[PDB]
Curated annotation (Swiss-Prot):
Effect in UniProt of substituting residue 6 to N: Does not affect subcellular targeting of pip
Quaternary structure and partners: Homodimer. Interacts with pip; the interaction is direct and does not require pip to be folded.
Name of the protein: Protein windbeutel
Location of the protein in the cell: Endoplasmic reticulum lumen
Lineage: Eukaryota, Metazoa, Ecdysozoa, Arthropoda, Hexapoda
Amino acid sequence: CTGCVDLDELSFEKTVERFPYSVVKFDIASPYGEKHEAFTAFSKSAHKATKDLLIATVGVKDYGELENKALGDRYKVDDKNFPSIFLFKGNADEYVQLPSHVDVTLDNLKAFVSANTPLYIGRDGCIKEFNEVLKNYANIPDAEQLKLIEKLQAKQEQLTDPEQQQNARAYLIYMRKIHEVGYDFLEEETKRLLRLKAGKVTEAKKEELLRKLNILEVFRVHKVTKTA
Ligand code: NA
């Protein structure tokens, strides 16, 4: 899958031991289907979020020299019940396995990382360096809102990743609209977005809307404390 590093008997231990954390799916060689697609989606997500996590695959072949059988056997991977998902903590000796009962989904894989490492794969659309300064934005004073607009506008112009540049536009719109009209903007925009999301929409269009809804979520506050 895109971003998934496929490892073998020669590369596995050496590569795992060079990253702070690795998540490895052991499966048949040339895997396919729902769990693999989830692992693919996971690779994409993890990649957008961090550089300290290796996303890797090991394909155990049933043919010829049985490449990677020894590797599978080192970790006692149940080859009657592929795929098997492992998380390694910086070397090939210190690891945890994904319980065999847990469905191999994008959500469950994100959860696996966050339960077993200091790493966090955020929501699609989010930008961590924006989020870290935006807590409680709707409630802070106008001058501090304007300072943050100027700051994140400067950050946006430096953004080199195309998705982050697009997602930054939504952050800025929301920052400006909330500064202009106040927290009522959250409800307005949530209803607009949900009307769209409730229409007949393609998967791509849904993903676009969800990214807007995820960025807008950053602006929700538990309590409105600023005057409207
Ligand atoms: Na931008």
